[PDB]
């Protein structure tokens, strides 16, 4: 067979140990999920420094805790705008997930609170910026570099899926690089805790699985499809399906055809054909062997999964770090006031926050 006795026994033991880890991780998650933390700091504990990111969601600001001097990234949402955009449930769910999960590649919520006007999630500051910026600058990542990041996503999805969390928002724009070169996943607005199927059309066109496009009920296999898109884009410098307009992108996604750069290794192409598999009965991550079809694939043969989890692998790339509070890996944005009204807005809606 492919493995002799010693290798087979080692792999089996490793796979059983994953099960044991995940069982304990679920117990811990469920305790925090059922009794979320609330109101663990306040706005005047922090100095506002600079805007790190802005969007329809709101803003993320670099802040400094006045006592410790520790920097954090503070996501600020205007309660009235959340209501207007019909994002109450997503916003509550994002905070609930973040305060309940615990994994080395998931950003940590250090504090959260609210005031008359806004909701605040204070997360660890991840100073390396978005993978997106580094990928577009460098052009593409070597296969070992892409593999290092991919392995972290595989472990992160193995963890999330064991909690019945589908992620649904994977793309380089949503992956940050920390000071040690490891990945941090931060955005949980599209994540959903659901054991079976779900139906919402959400995500980013290039990363949508065919079954989402085709308005099917779908499951956690969409995250494994998205991993295939991510690995492809990391290694090629462009995604597998693109076009001028989303409608065209969707046609390519559902077609069952993907083409690869000539520099892709055969191992990479085989993995990607099995992740970018339109037929759900054939897609890796969705078969009887589960995540093991991915972790045991030849493209990952050099990956020491425990060493990645323990963060003992030397990262292939370390972002420039001039010091605490350095924001040079993020873009510059027009700075807007943080208005706090004298009157409480949308109190009932956000009781759980």
């Amino acid at each position: 067979g492919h493995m002799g006795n010693a290798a087979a026994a080692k792999k089996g033991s490793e796979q059983e140990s994953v099960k044991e880890f995940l069982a304990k991780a679920k117990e811990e998650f469920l305790k925090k999920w059922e009794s979320p933390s609330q109101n663990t700091a306040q706005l005047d504990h922090f100095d506002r420094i600079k805007t790190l990111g802005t969007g329809s969601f709101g803003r993320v600001m670099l802040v400094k805790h006045k006592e410790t001097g520790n920097h954090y990234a503070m996501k600020i949402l205007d309660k009235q705008k959340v209501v207007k955009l019909k994002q109450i449930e997503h916003t509550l769910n994002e905070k609930r997930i973040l305060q309940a999960v615990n994994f080395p590649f998931l950003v940590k919520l250090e504090f959260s609170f609210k005031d008359n006007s806004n909701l605040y999630m204070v997360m660890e500051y991840v100073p390396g910026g978005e993978m997106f910026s580094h990928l577009r600058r460098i052009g593409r990542f070597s296969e070992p570099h892409a593999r290092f990041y991919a392995a972290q996503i595989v472990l992160t999805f193995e963890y999330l899926h064991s909690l019945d969390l589908i992620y649904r928002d994977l793309k380089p724009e949503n992956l940050l690089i920390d000071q040690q070169g490891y990945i941090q996943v931060t955005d949980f607005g599209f994540a959903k805790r659901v054991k079976g199927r779900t139906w919402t059309l959400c995500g980013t066109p290039e990363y949508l699985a065919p079954e989402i496009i085709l308005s099917k009920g779908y499951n956690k296999a969409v995250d494994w499809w998205a991993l295939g898109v991510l690995i492809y884009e990391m290694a090629a410098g462009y995604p597998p399906f693109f076009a001028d307009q989303p409608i065209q992108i969707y046609e390519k996604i559902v077609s069952g055809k993907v083409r690869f750069p000539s520099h892709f290794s055969s191992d990479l192409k085989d993995l990607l054909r099995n992740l970018l598999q339109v037929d759900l009965t054939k897609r890796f991550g969705n078969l009887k062997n589960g995540v093991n079809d991915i972790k045991n694939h030849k493209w990952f043969a050099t990956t020491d999964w425990i060493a990645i989890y323990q963060r003992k692998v030397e990262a292939p790339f370390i972002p420039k770090f001039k010091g605490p509070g350095d924001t040079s890996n993020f873009d510059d944005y027009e700075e807007e006031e943080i208005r706090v009204s004298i009157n409480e807005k949308c109190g009932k809606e956000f009781t759980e926050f």
Binding site: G55, R136, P205, E206, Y238, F242, P261
Partner: peptide, 20 residues
């Protein structure tokens, strides 16, 4: 080339999700 096609797509910058 595929790279040139990517640049021509106009989708080389940050990509919005569907709801945005």
């Amino acid at each position: 080339t595929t790279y040139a096609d990517f640049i021509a797509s106009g989708r080389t910058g940050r990509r919005n999700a569907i709801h945005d």
